[PDB]
Amino acid sequence: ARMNKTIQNLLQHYNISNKDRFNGKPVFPKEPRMETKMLFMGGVLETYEKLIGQMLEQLPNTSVRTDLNYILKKVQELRTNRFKEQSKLLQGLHDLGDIKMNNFIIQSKALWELQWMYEEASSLSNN
Amino acid sequence: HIPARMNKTIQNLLQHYNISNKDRFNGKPVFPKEPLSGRMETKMLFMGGVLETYEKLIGQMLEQLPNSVRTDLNYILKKVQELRTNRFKEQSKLLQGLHDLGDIKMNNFIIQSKALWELQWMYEEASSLSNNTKMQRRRRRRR
Questions:
Q1: CATH number, residue B20
Q2: Measured distance CA(A63)–CA(A94) in Å, rounded
Q3: A93–B97 CB contact, under 8 Å
Q4: CB neighbours of B127 closer than 8 A, spacing ≥ 6?
Q5: Crossing angle between the packed helical segments B119-129 and A34-58, to the nearest 10 degrees
Q6: Reduced to 3 states, what is the DSSP secondary structure of residue B36?
Q7: Set of chain A residues whose Cβ sits within 8 Å of the Cβ of B109
Q8: What Gene Ontology cellular component terms go with this record (chain B)?
Q9: How many domains does chain A fold into?
Q10: Whole domain around residue A91: which residue ranges?
Q11: CB B65 within 8 A of CB B94
């Protein structure tokens, strides 16, 4: 309930018009098995950590801050206590997005790893 | 266990894509095998991610070509696309969600307010979900 009261306050500061609200992309995709929903929401809490950290950074000089640190703490607590497995997987998934596509050595290393990787992928299906 | 043609085609490719055994086995593989433990859901998801990564890769390997390497690449691209599509539809869907969350413009003010407009709903949903007495019972197992 401090949560919800702190959020309404922040909304006073992070005020946008309806024209901006509805025009453009919706921020999130739609919530999609239980393990599937947990992981997605682990994605979501992680996003909020990231998001609120930029908000703090964008505050002047560097109560609003007091408010932001509260929701940051709360989001962090939930992720740390109840989303540990999901977070280890999400990191794996982010790590794949960092591989250097243009690098010749990596291309050739990946190429060599393809055989095992395609064996494994194939067998996971006809199980 | 894989097609002969896949194996053979990969070997032919490794001729053009030639590197020292030192640089190849420097203790840093491209793709970890570590996330192929735990549940079937986790393995399928991670594997779906690897197949998506390879499709990107092979793409670039085709761009960085000038002017039978090209057909060997195109063949290897096709077999990966086909496996993804035919066995990893559910996983690709989720992954597109996760990739999308990853891409959000977090330093933009409009985005911050829209995201903030959903925090309560999203926190509540996160919390509610994260004890259904199978998720709570599963989290107890690993302690």
A1: 1.20.1250.10
A2: 34
A3: no
A4: A78, A82
A5: 140
A6: coil
A7: 14, 16
A8: extracellular space
A9: 1
A10: 1-127
A11: no
In contact, A118 and B83? CB cutoff 8 Å: yes
Rounded Cα–Cα distance for residues A55 and B109 (Å): 8
Whole-number Å distance between alpha carbons of B59 and A19 = 39
Structure tokens at A110: 């990946």
When CB atoms are compared, the residue of B17, B38, B98 closest to A43 is B98
Interface touch A41/B98, C-beta < 8 Å: no
Alpha-carbon torsion, ordered A104, A110, A112, A117, to 10 deg: -170
A43–B114: do the CB atoms touch at under 8 Å? no
**How far is it, in rounded angstroms, from Cα B123 to Cα A7?**
11
> Quick count: other Cβ atoms within 10 Å of Cβ B67?
3
Query: Obtained via which technique?
Result: X-ray
Q: Quick check: B116 and A14 in contact, CB under 8 A? A: yes
For A2, counting Cβ atoms within 10 Å of its Cβ (0-12 exposed, 13-18 middle, 19+ buried), the class is: exposed
Phi, psi (5° rounding) for residue A97? Answer: -70, -10
Which letter does DSSP use for residue A39 in this model?
Answer: H
Please give the structure tokens belonging to residue A56.
Answer: 């703090």
- Find, in chain B, the residue whose alpha carbon is nearest to that of A40: B98
| A37/A28 Cα distance (integer angstroms) | 14
Provide the strand spans (E) within chain A: none
Q: Report resolution in angstroms.
A: 2.3
CA neighbor of B129 nearest in space, from A44, A1, A8: A44
